[PDB]
Paper text:
To test our approach in a real-life context, we chose to map the binding selectivity landscape of a broad-spectrum trypsin inhibitor, namely, the human amyloid protein precursor inhibitor (APPI; a member of the human Kunitz-domain family of serine protease inhibitors), to each of the four human serine proteases—kallikrein-6 (KLK6), mesotrypsin, anionic trypsin, and cationic trypsin—all of which share high-sequence homology and structural similarity. APPI has attracted our interest as a scaffold for engineering selective serine protease inhibitors due to the marked sequence diversity among Kunitz family members, which possess canonical binding loops that are highly tolerant to substitution or incorporation of additional amino acids. Because the sequence of the canonical binding loop and neighboring residues largely determine the affinity and selectivity of the inhibitor to its targets, using APPI as a scaffold offers a unique opportunity to optimize target affinity and selectivity without compromising stability. We chose the serine protease family as an ideal group of targets to demonstrate our strategy mainly because inhibiting the human serine proteases is of clinical value: both KLK6 and mesotrypsin are involved in cancer progression, while anionic and cationic trypsins are involved in the etiology of pancreatitis.
We chose the KLK6-selective T11V/G17R and T11S/G17R double-mutant variants, and their corresponding single-mutant selectivity-switch variants T11V, T11S, and G17R. The amino acid substitution that most increased the total selectivity of APPI-3M toward KLK6 was T11V/G17R, followed by G17R and finally, T11S/G17R. The individual substitutions T11V and T11S did not improve the selectivity toward KLK6, rather they somewhat decreased it. These results suggest that residues 11 and 17 are correlated-selectivity residues, which act together to increase target selectivity. For example, we found that the mutations T11V and G17R, when combined, yield a highly potent and selective inhibitor for KLK6, while combining the mutations T11S and G17R yield only a moderately potent and partially selective inhibitor for KLK6. To gain insight into the structural basis of the observed selectivity changes, we attempted to crystallize the APPI-3M-T11V/G17R variant in complex with the increased-selectivity target KLK6 and the reduced-selectivity target mesotrypsin. A structural analysis of this complex revealed that a deleterious steric interaction between the APPI Arg-17 mutation and mesotrypsin Arg-193 pushes Arg-193 into a more buried conformation, as previously found in the structures of mesotrypsin bound to wild-type APPI or BPTI Kunitz-type inhibitors. The steric clash and the restriction of Arg-193 to a single buried conformation can explain the reduction in affinity toward mesotrypsin, which is consistent with our prior structure and mutagenesis studies.
Numbering used by the authors:
A (entry chain E): 2 to 57
B (entry chain A): 16 to 34, 37 to 67, 69 to 125, 127 to 130, 132 to 184, 184A, 185 to 188, 188A, ...
């Protein structure tokens, strides 16, 4: 319910998906490389879905 | 590919990449109209490129074909990564020649200790990220599926086996997934997962293609 403070996680799998995570310390979303599998819920398809769920 | 080396042009005519905007996975051309990759590379809309060597410096001879069907294994499991294999049917059959060509399906399971070639345009570093443009290659042995489950307790299934070095420093990495591992001239596995890239006591886990030659063959006949 408060995953926005969880780190950006690539996970075990090895694709390169371009995803977005909320960077708690700069108050905005940033991109990270996501393996395609596993990880955490601080992971979203658009910079806009990310800000709508954890923006300030 | 971490610790590997740059392939020579043409030497992997079966190595194929998947795209939707950017390069997100590798693949294997197994028949004029079919490609084999991993199931966690699924995307509703994929463009398959063939014959590539430098991803951002092309010559006239590559081939761009949009996937017209993407079939993931019915028994794929997103959490455990079970049966992490998938097929792609190309909207137009590939032109087979000196730089685009097929790979034989595996006629026997992968013998532990056997040397294999693993390739792909994946990240070159274990700390940080450096995604290369020129196709990379790595020569690695199959390991005993007893050390494989020692490395990853409770997480191996009948579909997976390990390739690489237990010392670390050499492995496949993000963007390699779905790419081929070829042993004694046939396709023995699809790169799948791993804890980190080329870390100590964490080699790459790959998908046992031999366990799927029956399913891969029925799928091509029920979509032809």
């Amino acid at each position: 319910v408060e995953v926005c403070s969880e780190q950006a996680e690539v996970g075990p799998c090895r694709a390169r998906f371009s995803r977005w995570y909320f960077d708690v310390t700069e108050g905005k979303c940033a991109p990270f490389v996501y393996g395609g599998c596993g990880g955490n819920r601080n992971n979203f398809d658009t910079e806009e879905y990310c800000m709508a769920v954890c923006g300030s | 590919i971490v610790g590997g080396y740059t392939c020579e042009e043409n030497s992997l005519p079966y190595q194929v990449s998947l795209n939707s905007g950017s390069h997100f996975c590798g693949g294997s051309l197994i028949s004029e109209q079919w490609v084999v990759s991993a199931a966690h590379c699924y995307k509703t809309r994929i463009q398959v490129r063939l014959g590539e060597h430098n991803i951002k410096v092309l010559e006239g001879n590559e081939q761009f074909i949009n996937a017209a069907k993407i079939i993931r294994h019915p028994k794929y499991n997103r959490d455990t990564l079970d049966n992490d294999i998938m097929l792609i049917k190309l909207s137009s059959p590939a032109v087979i020649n000196a730089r685009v060509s097929t790979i034989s399906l595996p006629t026997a399971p992968p013998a532990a200790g056997t040397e294999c070639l693993i390739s792909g345009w994946g990240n070159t570093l274990s700390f940080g990220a450096d995604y290369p443009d020129e196709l990379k290659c790595l020569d690695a042995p199959v390991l005993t599926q007893a050390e494989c489950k020692a490395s990853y307790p409770g997480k191996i299934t009948n579909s997976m086996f390990c390739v690489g070095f237990l010392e670390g420093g050499k492995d496949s990495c993000q963007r390699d997934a779905g790419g081929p591992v070829v042993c004694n001239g046939q396709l023995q596995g699809v790169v799948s997962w791993g804890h980190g890239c080329a870390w100590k006591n964490r080699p790459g886990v790959y998908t046992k293609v031999y366990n799927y030659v029956d399913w891969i063959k029925d799928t091509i006949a029920a979509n032809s």
